[PDB]
Design a protein around this ligand. Sequence first.
Ligand SMILES: O=P(O)(O)C(O)(Cc1cnc2ccccn12)P(=O)(O)O
Ligand SMILES: O=P(O)(O)C(O)(Cc1cnc2ccccn12)P(=O)(O)O
Ligand SMILES: C=C(C)CCOP(=O)(O)OP(=O)(O)O
Ligand SMILES: C=C(C)CCOP(=O)(O)OP(=O)(O)O
Ligand SMILES: [Mg+2]
Ligand SMILES: [Mg+2]
Ligand SMILES: [Mg+2]
Ligand SMILES: [Mg+2]
Ligand SMILES: [Mg+2]
Ligand SMILES: [Mg+2]
Lengths: 362, 362
Amino acid sequence: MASMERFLSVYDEVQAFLLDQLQSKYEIDPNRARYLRIMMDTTCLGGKYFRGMTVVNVAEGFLAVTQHDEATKERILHDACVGGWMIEFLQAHYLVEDDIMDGSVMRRGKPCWYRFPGVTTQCAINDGIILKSWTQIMAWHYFADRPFLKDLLCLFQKVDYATAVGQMYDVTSMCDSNKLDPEVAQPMTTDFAEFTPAIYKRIVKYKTTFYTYLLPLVMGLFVSEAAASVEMNLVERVAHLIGEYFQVQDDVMDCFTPPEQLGKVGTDIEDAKCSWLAVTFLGKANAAQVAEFKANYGDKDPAKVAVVKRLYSEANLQADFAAYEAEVVREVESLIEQLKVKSPTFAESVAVVWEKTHKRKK
Amino acid sequence: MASMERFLSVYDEVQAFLLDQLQSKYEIDPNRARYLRIMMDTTCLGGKYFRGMTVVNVAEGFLAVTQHDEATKERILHDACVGGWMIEFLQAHYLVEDDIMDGSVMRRGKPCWYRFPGVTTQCAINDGIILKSWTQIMAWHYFADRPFLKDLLCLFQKVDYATAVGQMYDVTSMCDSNKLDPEVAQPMTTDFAEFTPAIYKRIVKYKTTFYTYLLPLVMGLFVSEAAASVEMNLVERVAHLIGEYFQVQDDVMDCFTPPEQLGKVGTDIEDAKCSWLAVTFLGKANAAQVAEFKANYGDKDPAKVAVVKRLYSEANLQADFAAYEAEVVREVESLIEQLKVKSPTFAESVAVVWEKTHKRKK
Ligand SMILES: O=P(O)(O)C(O)(Cc1cnc2ccccn12)P(=O)(O)O
Ligand SMILES: O=P(O)(O)C(O)(Cc1cnc2ccccn12)P(=O)(O)O
Ligand SMILES: C=C(C)CCOP(=O)(O)OP(=O)(O)O
Ligand SMILES: C=C(C)CCOP(=O)(O)OP(=O)(O)O
Ligand SMILES: [Mg+2]
Ligand SMILES: [Mg+2]
Ligand SMILES: [Mg+2]
Ligand SMILES: [Mg+2]
Ligand SMILES: [Mg+2]
Ligand SMILES: [Mg+2]
C-alpha cells in the first residue's frame, strides 16, 4: 500500500534523527547504535500500523474539507506521521514489557524481543524504557514549536498512565481481590468470581482502548487543530467501544487462531488470564463444565490446556461472539451516526477505523 | 530533621491525590489501591531524600535573597517539594527496574520490591512503569498552570532519556563492543579492555549524573524562575563532577560497606560490572594480579568473589580513592568559586549538596 510506505518513510526520518543524536550528543559507539537500530526495527516494525495510520487517516480527513496551502498540507501530514509513530513507539514499549510479563514466545512472526539471544530480560526491560523515552524525544523535537504541544503531551501521558493501570488490572486478574497483598504470595482464584463481564470490561477499558483508539483518534484531531469541531464525549465512547471489540478479537485469536496466521503464540489459558473466552464460558457453562474448567485453567500443562480448549469448543463460544459482534455493530453505527451531526468527515474516519477493525484476521 | 518532615508531608498530599484519583477516575478497588499505596511507600520512601531535598534547598536559597509575599514563599516551597517528589518518583522507577536488571536482593534494608512475595518480576516491571507515570501525573496536576512547565517537562524527559541510555551502557559494560549483537548470545569480555577511566566516566555520566544532580539543581532553579541568573555551563559541569563522585562512592560501598550499614547487598563483582574498583584495579595491578582477576570476576561463586575482594584489598585501592577524592574537592571548590560570580546563593546551595555528598556513609 502506497500510504504505508509514506508513513514508513517518516520512520526512517525519525530513526535517523534519533540515531544521529545518540552518536552526536550521547557518545554512543556504532555497535550500541546498531543494537538500538535493530531493537527499534524489531519492536517498532512489522505490525499492522493501524494505530499510527489511524492518526494519518483522521488528518487526511480534515484536509479534504478544509482550505490550506500546499505546505501546510505537507506539514500537517508530516505531523500526523510523527504523531502516529509516537503511538507506535508507545505500543512497542508496552509490547516489549508485556511479552516479558506474559511469558510470550513470538510476536510478528519473530521471537519476542527479550527472547533474542543477544538481548535477554535484563536488557529488554531497559530497551522498553528507551522506547518510551524515544516518544518524548520525537514530540519535543518535531513539535516543540506547535500550538497543540501541551494538549498532545497531556493526553499522551494520561493515555500512558491509563494503560499502565490497565496492565496492573490484567496481570492481577486471576487473583482474588481480597487476597491481593504485596507481603503474601498471590494464589490463583478458585472461585473465578471476578471473571465477570463488568470486570472484564474495566480491565480492557484501561489496558487497551485508550492507546489503541482514543489516543490515535484524538491525536489526529490535535494535529489537525480540529478538536473543537467534534463531540468529545462521542469520540471517547466510540473509542472505548471499538477498543473493547478489538481486545475481544484478540482474546478469541489467542486460543483459536493458528500461530502462523497470528504471528504470536497464545498464552492466556496458561497465564490464567481473565479473557473474553473465559468470562463468556463461565457465563453459559453448566456445573460440570465450570468444575472441569476450574481444574484445568492456569497451568502450562499442554494437556490441561487441551481440556480448556475442548471446553471452549463444547460451549459453542462462536455463537456468543456473533451476538457480541452484532451488538457492537449496532452501537458503533449508532455512535458514528451521532458523530455525523457536528462532524461528517470525522465520523467517516471512525467508519474506516471500524471497518479495518471489524475485518481483521491477525 | 524538621525540613524532611515538611517534604514528607507533601508526599502524603501527593499520595492522597494520586490514590483518590485512582478510586474516582480509574475505578480501582480498595485492595489494588492498597497494593499501590504499599508499592509507593516501599519504592518511594526510606531513602536519604537527597534528590528531592536538593530542589528544596536550591529554592530556599533564592527565597532568602529575594522579596516575596508570604503566599509566594509558600507556593514556591510547595512547588519545590512536588518537583522534588517527581525526581524521587523518577528514581523509585529506575531502582525498581535496576534491582531486577542487576539481580539485587535488598534496598533500604528491605527486600527489593520484586522480591516481595506478593509482587514478583511480572508485577514489578509494571509497578515500575506506574512510578514513572505518577511523575507526569503530578507535574500536570500541580504545575499545568506554571510558566516553567514546558521547561520543566522538557528537561525531565531529557534527563530520563540520558538515564535510560546510561542504563543501557551499564548493563552492556561487560560485553566487548564489537561482539554486541541482538542475534548472538553475549559473552563476557576476557580482555577487560573497555574497563577504562574514559569509558567508566561515560557510563556514569548518563546513568547517574543527570537525574542525581543536574535535574534537582536545575529544577530548583526552574521553580524559582532563577535559571537566567546562573552560568548554565557551570551548573552542568558541577553536576557531572559531583555525580561522578557520588557513583564512585556507590561502587566502593558495593564491595566494602557491610550490608547492614548500606541497606543493600553488593552485586557488582558477580554482575561483572565496569565499576570504579575494577577500573582502578586494572589501572594499577601487575600481570599476575590482572590474570587472577580475569579468572574470578563476573561469577556468583562466593569463593571467586572472595578472591576479587582480596585482590582489591591487596591493590590498596583506598589510596587511589583518596587521590581521586582530593582531585574532586579541588575541582568542585573551583566550580563553586566560579558559580559565585553571577550567583553566590546558588553556589552556596551547590556547596551544601557537595558537603552532604562528601560526608555520606550509605
Ligand atoms: O500480548 P497480546 O498482544 O496478546 C495482548 O493484546 C497485548 C496487550 C493488550 N493491551 C496491552 C496494553 C499494554 C501492553 C500490552 N497489551 P494482551 O492484553 O492479551 O497481553
Ligand atoms: O543498584 P545501585 O544503587 O547500586 C546503583 O547506583 C544503582 C543506579 C545508579 N544509577 C542508576 C540509574 C538508573 C537506575 C539505577 N541506578 P548501580 O548503578 O550500581 O546499579
Ligand atoms: C490487543 C492489543 C491492543 C495488543 C495487540 O496489538 P496489535 O495486534 O495491534 O499488535 P501489532 O498489530 O502492532 O502487531
Ligand atoms: C548511585 C546511585 C545514583 C543509586 C543509589 O541511589 P541512592 O543511594 O541515592 O538511593 P537512596 O538514597 O534513594 O536509597
Ligand atoms: Mg500479552
Ligand atoms: Mg498482557
Ligand atoms: Mg492477547
Ligand atoms: Mg543496581
Ligand atoms: Mg545497575
Ligand atoms: Mg551500585
